[PDB]
Amino acid sequence: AMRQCAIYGKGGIGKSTTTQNLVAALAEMGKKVMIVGCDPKADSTRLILHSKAQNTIMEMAAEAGTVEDLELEDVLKAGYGGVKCVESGGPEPGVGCAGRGVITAINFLEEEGAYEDDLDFVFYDVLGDVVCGGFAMPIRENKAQEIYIVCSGEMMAMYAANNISKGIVKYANSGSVRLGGLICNSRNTDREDELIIALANKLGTQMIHFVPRDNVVQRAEIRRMTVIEYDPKAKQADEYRALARKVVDNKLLVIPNPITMDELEELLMEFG
Amino acid sequence: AMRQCAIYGKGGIGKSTTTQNLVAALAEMGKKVMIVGCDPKADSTRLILHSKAQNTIMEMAAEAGTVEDLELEDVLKAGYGGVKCVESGGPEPGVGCAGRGVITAINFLEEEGAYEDDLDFVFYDVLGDVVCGGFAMPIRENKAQEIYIVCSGEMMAMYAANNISKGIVKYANSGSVRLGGLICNSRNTDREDELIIALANKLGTQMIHFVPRDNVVQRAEIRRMTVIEYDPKAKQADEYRALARKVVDNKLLVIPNPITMDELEELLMEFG
Numbered sequence: 435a436m437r438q439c440a441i442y443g444k445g446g447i448g449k450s451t452t453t454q455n456l457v458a459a460l461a462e463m464g465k466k467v468m469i470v471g472c473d474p475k476a477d478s479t480r481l482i483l484h485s486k487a488q489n490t491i492m493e494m495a496a497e498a499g500t501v502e503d504l505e506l507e508d509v510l511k512a513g514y515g516g517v518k519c520v521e522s523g524g525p526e527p528g529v530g531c532a533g534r535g536v537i538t539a540i541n542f543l544e545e546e547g548a549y550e551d552d553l554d555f556v557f558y559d560v561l562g563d564v565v566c567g568g569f570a571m572p573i574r575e576n577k578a579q580e581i582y583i584v585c586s587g588e589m590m591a592m593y594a595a596n597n598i599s600k601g602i603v604k605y606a607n608s609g610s611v612r613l614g615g616l617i618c619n620s621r622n623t624d625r626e627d628e629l630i631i632a633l634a635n636k637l638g639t640q641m642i643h644f645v646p647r648d649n650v651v652q653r654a655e656i657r658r659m660t661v662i663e664y665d666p667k668a669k670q671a672d673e674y675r676a677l678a679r680k681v682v683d684n685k686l687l688v689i690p691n692p693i694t695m696d697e698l699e700e701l702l703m704e705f706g
Numbered sequence: 707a708m709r710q711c712a713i714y715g716k717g718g719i720g721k722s723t724t725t726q727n728l729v730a731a732l733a734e735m736g737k738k739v740m741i742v743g744c745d746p747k748a749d750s751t752r753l754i755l756h757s758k759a760q761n762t763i764m765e766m767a768a769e770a771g772t773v774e775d776l777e778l779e780d781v782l783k784a785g786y787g788g789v790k791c792v793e794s795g796g797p798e799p800g801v802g803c804a805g806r807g808v809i810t811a812i813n814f815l816e817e818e819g820a821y822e823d824d825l826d827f828v829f830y831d832v833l834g835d836v837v838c839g840g841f842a843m844p845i846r847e848n849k850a851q852e853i854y855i856v857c858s859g860e861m862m863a864m865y866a867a868n869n870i871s872k873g874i875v876k877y878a879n880s881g882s883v884r885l886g887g888l889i890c891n892s893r894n895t896d897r898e899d900e901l902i903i904a905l906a907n908k909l910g911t912q913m914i915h916f917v918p919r920d921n922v923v924q925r926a927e928i929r930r931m932t933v934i935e936y937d938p939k940a941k942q943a944d945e946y947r948a949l950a951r952k953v954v955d956n957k958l959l960v961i962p963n964p965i966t967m968d969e970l971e972e973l974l975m976e977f978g
């Protein structure tokens with residue numbers, strides 16, 4: 435068995451920081467993990483690889499001729515804890531569908547047999563400001579069985595969570611894609627944990643963990659590291675370990691119940 | 707003559723708040739303005755209309771049969787200061803291209819002759835987390851002659867500004883789409899104005915105004931109003947008046963020079 439998880443959320447909310455730290459904590463426990471970057475920013479693996487970023491499948495296919503000229507052993511790169519990493523890439527702005535590289539990358543990984551039985555987890559890090567094209571592909575095509583949405587008390591972050599939830603509902607009649615939980619990535623605001631717990635309850639899920647705002651994240655990332663590797667004694671490292679444990683143990687996977695704009699505004703008004 | 711301006715930027719950065727307040731200030735001066743919402747969130751006109759949001763062209767076309775069954779006088783709605791408002795809408799998440807409604811809306815407005823000589827400004831409020839499909843249409847098809855990018859000292863907001871700038875460069879050989887400036891929408895961080903001035907200088911543009919973070923914005927928006935209407939004496943109202951004056955007087959419209967990721971990181975490291 436292997437569990438296929440996707441991390442969605444609005445831009446800049448903390449998807450890549452949360453995913454790479456969560457995965458580093460999993461590797462620290464002894465799990466074998468692959469990260470698939472599905473955001474055109476293409477910096478979803480840099481903290482595992484200690485790198486500037488990673489060259490993308492779209493780029494490598496173009497340099498090599500066709501995607502068929504690429505071998506898996508040439509594309510996947512291992513970093514901290516043996517975690518295997520790949521970036522989809524995407525077309526330049528104004529040219530074609532920004533999600534087109536996700537389709538190419540996931541199909542390549544499947545065909546080349548990247549999904550060996552000994553992987554325990556695959557994490558997709560997916561842009562979530564729009565749910566369409568290649569960004570909807572992990573849901574539409576049954577690749578991301580367990581979706582976790584990173585969010586905050588920010589209206590826009592909560593709206594994105596509701597929109598991703600609507601996409602999950604749209605494809606509920608096929609496949610097994612389900613909402614596994616919300617991850618609150620704190621803005622240091624009061625009762626923010628209670629706000630995201632309330633939103634999760636309205637959607638029918640749970641808030642799996644509250645990740646505090648902590649400057650150690652920036653200090654680790656300036657050095658191209660996860661907090662798990664940079665300072666394993668840090669309180670924030672233990673926060674990511676707790677998140678990873680709760681993902682491992684999570685048994686609640688639901689078809690969510692999206693809410694109205696009126697319900698979302700009422701939520702902010704009450705906790706604010 | 708009429709000036710066609712588009713406001714781009716990452717999600718949640720302040721596009722709709724800035725656009726509606728800027729436009730209210732223009733109307734307060736006596737300019738005739740239309741706002742075209744080009745973000746699927748479809749709340750880009752609510753503060754002018756005092757409304758929950760606005761029913762979208764996509765919705766109205768479906769209820770009426772075809773877009774040809776709609777008349778312009780039925781779709782455009784006027785609010786504060788006579789400002790005319792329309793929302794594109796878009797398909798539900800997971801269904802089709804999130805930008806598809808922008809194409810339908812702009813073509814409808816052009817065909818129905820919404821661009822009367824007596825309009826002084828048209829503002830498009832455009833999602834900018836991806837630059838593709840209908841969201842690239844205002845650039846690709848020469849609709850948004852002057853682009854202003856709302857941003858902040860946030861890495862993701864600055865990255866989005868660079869990506870939008872790359873889209874402008876891609877279409878530089880046709881049409882007249884140009885970058886008019888950056889608008890800094892403050893995060894209450896130190897030297898944030900200097901950071902965005904530096905980014906603008908590297909792109910070849912200017913930072914047209916620094917908009918402070920001010921709680922009066924939330925108090926106005928809870929009441930579905932611009933600050934200009936809610937509290938015309940507020941310091942923040944004068945900030946939006948200054949922004950509007952500087953847009954009116956702006957003569958610098960450039961093909962921007964996008965920067966590397968290394969340059970962008972160096973910018974944050976220096977000012978941080």
Ligand SMILES: Nc1ncnc2c1ncn2[C@@H]1O[C@H](COP(=O)(O)OP(=O)(O)O)[C@@H](O)[C@H]1O
Pocket residue numbers: 443444445446447448449450451452619620645646647648649651652655861862
């Ligand atoms: N819990 C946290 N504490 C401090 N900084 C954080 C935290 N989470 C994210 N960040 C910072 O926020 C910024 C955006 O995070 P990132 O994971 O790149 O967002 P996304 O992948 O969703 O666009 C990064 O600079 C990151 O270091």
Ligand SMILES: Nc1ncnc2c1ncn2[C@@H]1O[C@H](COP(=O)(O)OP(=O)(O)O)[C@@H](O)[C@H]1O
Pocket residue numbers: 589590715716717718719720721722723724891892917918919920921923924927
């Ligand atoms: N200068 C400001 N001061 C205080 N709050 C602001 C300011 N600019 C924006 N906001 C708030 O930020 C949130 C997002 O703004 P919005 O214009 O809706 O973003 P976008 O249209 O880019 O998604 C809104 O709640 C808005 O009231």
Ligand SMILES: [Mg+2]
Pocket residue numbers: 449450451473475477478559
């Ligand atoms: Mg990311």
Ligand SMILES: [Mg+2]
Pocket residue numbers: 721722723745747749750831
């Ligand atoms: Mg908006």
